[PDB]
Amino acid sequence: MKKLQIAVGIIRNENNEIFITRRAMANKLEFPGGKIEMGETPEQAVVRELQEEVGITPQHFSLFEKLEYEFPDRHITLWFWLVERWEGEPWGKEGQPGEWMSLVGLNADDFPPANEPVIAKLKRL
Ligand code: NA
């Protein structure tokens, strides 16, 4: 039994827009994120992952949602962090250009199914 945990960043600006990436579900939207390494905490992981993939250092953030998946010999945990303040400007730092999408025009169906409960929550408030 081993764990695989993913730190996910929900970067939201002042205009209720979120920074998302598009995939080449050939065009579904996704949140930036990556694996939490051994010896690294969930908070340290989302900061590092965003610094590496998006070019920002999250300063003000909180746990927005936590999803668990139990498969044979593997437990998966997705940590979704709502990032409201940061240093830097999001961009395709490692070739993964993202884009700002307003929540008013976003549909959960545009994201892979795992994101459903997160999008619903984002659009409520
Ligand atoms: Na990574």
Tokens of 89: 């400007």
Domain that holds residue 26: 1-125
Experimental resolution (Å) = 1.8
111 is in an annotated binding site: no
Which residues fall inside 5 Å of ion ligand 1, going by CB?
34-35
* Overall domain count for the chain: 1
CA angle 113, 117, 119 (to 5 degrees): 85
Phi, psi of 88 (to 5 degrees): 100, -175
**Is 23 annotated as a binding-site member?**
yes
- Is 49 annotated in a binding site? The answer is no
Question: Is 30 marked within a binding site?
Answer: yes
CA 115 to chain centre: 10
Yes or no: say if 82 and 43 are a contact pair by the CB < 8 Å rule.
no
Which tokens is 6 given? 């993913």
Report d(CA 107, CA 3) in Å as an integer: 30
Q: Which helix (H) or strand (E) holds 123?
A: helix 116-124
- Which CATH number goes with the domain that contains 70? 3.90.79.10
Amino acid at 81: W
CA of 34 to the centre of ligand 1 (A): 4
Distance in angstroms (rounded) separating the CA atoms of residues 74 and 62 = 26
Helix, strand, or coil (residue 38):
coil
Residue 53 annotated as binding site: yes
Distance 88 CA to ligand 1 centre (A): 19
